[PDB]
Scaffold this active site. Structure first.
Site, PDB file in Angstrom:
ATOM      1  CG  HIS A  98      31.891  -6.616   2.722  1.00 15.95           C
ATOM      2  ND1 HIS A  98      31.318  -6.136   1.671  1.00 15.95           N
ATOM      3  CD2 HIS A  98      33.150  -7.263   2.523  1.00 15.95           C
ATOM      4  CE1 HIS A  98      32.312  -6.327   0.577  1.00 15.95           C
ATOM      5  NE2 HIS A  98      32.982  -7.130   1.095  1.00 15.95           N
ATOM      6  CD  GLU A  99      35.539  -7.826   5.334  1.00 13.43           C
ATOM      7  OE1 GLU A  99      35.816  -8.903   4.698  1.00 13.43           O
ATOM      8  OE2 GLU A  99      35.569  -6.586   4.837  1.00 13.43           O
ATOM      9  CG  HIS A 115      33.612 -12.008   1.610  1.00 11.07           C
ATOM     10  ND1 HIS A 115      33.560 -12.124   0.220  1.00 11.07           N
ATOM     11  CD2 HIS A 115      34.303 -10.748   1.794  1.00 11.07           C
ATOM     12  CE1 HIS A 115      33.784 -10.835  -0.357  1.00 11.07           C
ATOM     13  NE2 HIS A 115      34.079  -9.952   0.592  1.00 11.07           N
ATOM     14  CE1 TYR A 127      35.995 -11.334  -3.598  1.00 13.49           C
ATOM     15  CE2 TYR A 127      38.499 -10.972  -3.634  1.00 13.49           C
ATOM     16  CZ  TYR A 127      37.390 -10.309  -3.254  1.00 13.49           C
ATOM     17  OH  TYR A 127      37.184  -9.309  -2.578  1.00 13.49           O
ATOM     18  CD  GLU A 145      33.958  -7.474  -2.450  1.00  8.41           C
ATOM     19  OE1 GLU A 145      33.698  -6.416  -2.298  1.00  8.41           O
ATOM     20  OE2 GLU A 145      34.720  -8.507  -1.925  1.00  8.41           O
ATOM     21  CG  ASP A 170      39.390  -4.902  -7.333  1.00  3.97           C
ATOM     22  OD1 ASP A 170      39.929  -5.557  -6.161  1.00  3.97           O
ATOM     23  OD2 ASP A 170      38.350  -4.506  -7.595  1.00  3.97           O
ATOM     24  CG  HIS A 208      36.788  -4.804  -4.161  1.00  8.31           C
ATOM     25  ND1 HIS A 208      37.784  -5.402  -4.322  1.00  8.31           N
ATOM     26  CD2 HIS A 208      36.281  -5.017  -3.128  1.00  8.31           C
ATOM     27  CE1 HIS A 208      37.982  -6.339  -3.397  1.00  8.31           C
ATOM     28  NE2 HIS A 208      37.147  -6.139  -2.449  1.00  8.31           N
TER      29      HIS A 208
HETATM   30  C1  LIG Z   1      33.912  -3.242   3.122  1.00  8.86           C
HETATM   31  C2  LIG Z   1      35.589  -2.656   3.012  1.00  8.86           C
HETATM   32  C3  LIG Z   1      35.804  -1.592   3.897  1.00  8.86           C
HETATM   33  C4  LIG Z   1      36.527  -3.791   2.960  1.00  8.86           C
HETATM   34  C5  LIG Z   1      36.525  -4.872   1.845  1.00  8.86           C
HETATM   35  N1  LIG Z   1      37.322  -5.973   2.127  1.00  8.86           N
HETATM   36  P1  LIG Z   1      37.277  -7.339   1.224  1.00  8.86           P
HETATM   37  O1  LIG Z   1      36.420  -7.092   0.002  1.00  8.86           O
HETATM   38  O2  LIG Z   1      36.595  -8.557   2.195  1.00  8.86           O
HETATM   39  C6  LIG Z   1      38.962  -8.040   0.874  1.00  8.86           C
HETATM   40  N2  LIG Z   1      39.019  -9.544   0.657  1.00  8.86           N
HETATM   41  C7  LIG Z   1      39.943 -10.033  -0.140  1.00  8.86           C
HETATM   42  O3  LIG Z   1      40.669  -9.559  -0.756  1.00  8.86           O
HETATM   43  O4  LIG Z   1      39.332 -11.544  -0.243  1.00  8.86           O
HETATM   44  C8  LIG Z   1      40.371 -12.327  -0.923  1.00  8.86           C
HETATM   45  C9  LIG Z   1      41.170 -13.337   0.353  1.00  8.86           C
HETATM   46  C10 LIG Z   1      40.774 -14.710  -0.026  1.00  8.86           C
HETATM   47  C11 LIG Z   1      41.502 -15.323   0.927  1.00  8.86           C
HETATM   48  C12 LIG Z   1      42.386 -14.933   1.892  1.00  8.86           C
HETATM   49  C13 LIG Z   1      42.811 -13.615   1.777  1.00  8.86           C
HETATM   50  C14 LIG Z   1      42.072 -12.585   0.979  1.00  8.86           C
HETATM   51  C15 LIG Z   1      36.784  -4.128   0.317  1.00  8.86           C
HETATM   52  O5  LIG Z   1      36.069  -3.401  -0.267  1.00  8.86           O
HETATM   53  N3  LIG Z   1      38.024  -3.998   0.144  1.00  8.86           N
HETATM   54  C16 LIG Z   1      38.518  -3.209  -0.959  1.00  8.86           C
HETATM   55  C17 LIG Z   1      39.562  -2.527  -0.564  1.00  8.86           C
HETATM   56  C18 LIG Z   1      39.592  -1.354   0.538  1.00  8.86           C
HETATM   57  C19 LIG Z   1      40.089  -1.704  -1.905  1.00  8.86           C
HETATM   58  C20 LIG Z   1      41.723  -1.010  -1.786  1.00  8.86           C
HETATM   59  C21 LIG Z   1      40.378  -3.030  -3.110  1.00  8.86           C
HETATM   60  C22 LIG Z   1      39.404  -0.701  -2.600  1.00  8.86           C
HETATM   61 ZN   LIG Z   2      34.519  -8.276  -0.023  1.00  7.92          ZN
END
Ligand SMILES: CC(C)C[C@H](NP(=O)(O)CNC(=O)OCc1ccccc1)C(=O)NC[C@H](C)C(C)(C)C
Ligand SMILES: [Zn+2]
Ligand SMILES: [Ca+2]
Ligand SMILES: [Ca+2]
Ligand SMILES: [Ca+2]
Ligand SMILES: [Ca+2]
EC number: 3.4.24.27
Length: 316
Positions: free
Chosen positions: A142-143, A146, A157, A166, A226, A231
């Site tokens: 997933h990461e 991105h 985003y 997402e 969010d 998400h």
């Molecule tokens: C797969 C999961 C385990 C991890 C995933 N992280 P991600 O979606 O990769 C967060 N990324 C993000 O916020 O990117 C924006 C950005 C852009 C530039 C610098 C910094 C940040 C997620 O689903 N997170 C959701 C979280 C846990 C909640 C609390 C909202 C439910």
């Molecule tokens: Zn994500």
């Protein structure tokens, strides 16, 4: 660092043993030279300065508890690299074998993981909501996805484009989980979420509503939390992707499944040839229809199933 390629052994977050590609130069480093221009894993040492220090180890054995998140971030980045190269002929996230960098032990009690524009970053969790998040192959993929999105479609985003962003990360996270073929499912984050609760996950693609997320456009979130629900509203696209692959009848609309490989081909082509930074859900439908038409033909079952699936989730 300059050195010679080596093979270490260690244990991941869930206690499983695996070999890892390392580099020897005085110390053994978490630097895998076998893939592109390298995969590099760093220790953030419970702080928020990034990347931290390239992970160094005296003996090439990685069995300490502190080592486990690094082992898995490093190993699962390799699996994800292999998926993109072998399945989609894509060389790293930029298509040109960019070095892949991850930091583990980010912050204290940190219940998240992210791509920061330049690298992957994993918390250790607080031991209640999450254990160290690199223990989930779907999370790691997933990461990294991105980064792929940012280099290709560039989906902004927030709001619908951000929910597509997402969903793309959840879709390919799941397809990588199936590629590795260890306990694969259509759930997100189950291996690292809520160690005290069995059978749950952060999101479900097969039934998003199980964890509060919409499974139909008429149930989309329209508020500001969010980033406009990125998400949350991802559930609508995740459900469509699940239906394309696996089939089903959803709100009375029947979808003939075409399988995971064709799902991945359709969505990879849509992401890399048709989507733009501001694409909305309706434009994603059009991009997926066009992609399936390119790959399989206008009269194909694959095109018909893409249309069925977006109809089932209320996206025209
Ligand atoms: C797969 C999961 C385990 C991890 C995933 N992280 P991600 O979606 O990769 C967060 N990324 C993000 O916020 O990117 C924006 C950005 C852009 C530039 C610098 C910094 C940040 C997620 O689903 N997170 C959701 C979280 C846990 C909640 C609390 C909202 C439910
Ligand atoms: Zn994500
Ligand atoms: Ca060691
Ligand atoms: Ca699984
Ligand atoms: Ca999963
Ligand atoms: Ca759990």
């Amino acid at each position: 660092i300059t050195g010679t390629s080596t093979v270490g052994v260690g244990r991941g977050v869930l206690g499983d043993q695996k070999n890892i590609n390392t580099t020897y130069s005085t110390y053994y480093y978490l630097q895998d030279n076998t893939r592109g221009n390298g995969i590099f894993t760093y220790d953030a040492k419970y702080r928020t300065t990034l990347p931290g220090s390239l992970w160094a180890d005296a003996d090439n054995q990685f069995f300490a508890s502190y080592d486990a998140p690094a082992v898995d971030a490093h190993y699962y980045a390799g699996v994800t690299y292999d998926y993109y190269k072998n399945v989609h002929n894509r060389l790293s996230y930029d298509g040109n074998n960019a070095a892949i960098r991850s930091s583990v032990h980010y912050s204290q009690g940190y219940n998240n993981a992210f791509w920061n524009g330049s690298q992957m970053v994993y918390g250790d969790g607080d031991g209640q909501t999450f254990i160290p998040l690199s223990g989930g192959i779907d999370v790691v993929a997933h990461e990294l996805t991105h980064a792929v999105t940012d280099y290709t479609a560039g989906l902004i985003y927030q709001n619908e484009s951000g929910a597509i962003n997402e969903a793309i990360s959840d879709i390919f996270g799941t397809l990588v989980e199936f590629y590795a073929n260890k306990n694969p499912d259509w759930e997100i984050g189950e291996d690292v979420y809520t160690p005290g609760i069995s059978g749950d996950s952060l999101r479900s693609m097969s039934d998003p509503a199980k964890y509060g997320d919409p499974d139909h456009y008429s149930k989309r979130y329209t508020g500001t939390q969010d980033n406009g629900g990125v998400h949350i509203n991802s559930g609508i696209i995740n459900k469509a992707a699940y239906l394309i692959s696996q089939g089903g009848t959803h709100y009375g609309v029947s979808v003939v499944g075409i399988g995971r490989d064709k799902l991945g081909k359709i969505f990879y082509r849509a992401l890399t040839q048709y989507l733009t930074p501001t694409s909305n859900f309706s434009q994603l439908r059009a991009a997926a229809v066009q992609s399936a038409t390119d790959l399989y033909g206008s009269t194909s079952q694959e095109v018909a199933s893409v249309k069925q699936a977006f109809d089932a989730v209320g996206v025209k």
